[PDB]
Amino acid sequence: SRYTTEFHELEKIGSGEFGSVFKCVKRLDGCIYAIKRSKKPLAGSVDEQNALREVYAHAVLGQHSHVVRYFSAWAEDDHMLIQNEYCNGGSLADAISENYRIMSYFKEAELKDLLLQVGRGLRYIHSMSLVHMDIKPSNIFISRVMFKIGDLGHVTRISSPQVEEGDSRFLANEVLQENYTHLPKADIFALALTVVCAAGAEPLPRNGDQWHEIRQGRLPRIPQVLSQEFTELLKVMIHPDPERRPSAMALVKHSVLLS
């Protein structure tokens, strides 16, 4: 077993219908990696479709500060195994849960830092003519601080997009309308709501009235004191017209964020 041979398994850090993710130490270099382990999907399934998007995202993407690094991938015993960078801070979703429990928070500044850092990640992905298509707190990881985009199973081309929608909570209406002419801006829409989650918003609606209200450009209720200036940035990021939303480029260079 390559897995057993090359790595020692330390602890399970993730699980879902997607499979499991394990904290492992690689024997050769003593370093910690996150190994995603998944049952090999049925041929011609959504699962195989998902799986394929991730393989070829790696093939195209190089290393980047704000994208979870991919090291290798292989298969054995009808399972697919992917060796990733380990982020010792866990996910932004875990962090928000902890805040909601311990009763700390992300200061307005820390929210600006998160937007900019994930913004930098997107700028890079978009520059390689790809889109992530599932930005949300659980797909943003933390290394201790650095924020990094993970889970590339929804990644597709800007030009010839094969679109499996991400989480309905973070989804731009135009994508639901089968409009794929400006996919990068769906990532921007989705980042904005991710930040609003970090800022302590009540859980985001999955559909119904409040879902629609948001896609009219209406921000969820925040529990804290944010400047009108940062507010408008977050607001225009969920503008119903995707062309009015900042590109990742315009984002990373925006006056409010820097720095």
Ligand SMILES: CNC(=O)c1nn(C)c2c1C(C)(C)Cc1cnc(Nc3ccc(N4CCN(C)CC4)cc3)nc1-2
């Ligand atoms: C579809 N699954 C994933 O993409 C995925 N899920 N996780 C949990 C990770 C991934 C990646 C993107 C494939 C790689 C990765 C890289 N690092 C972590 N780090 C991490 C560290 C600690 C924790 N936890 C702290 C809070 N807990 C007690 C649960 C473990 C969770 C994740 N997680 C992951």
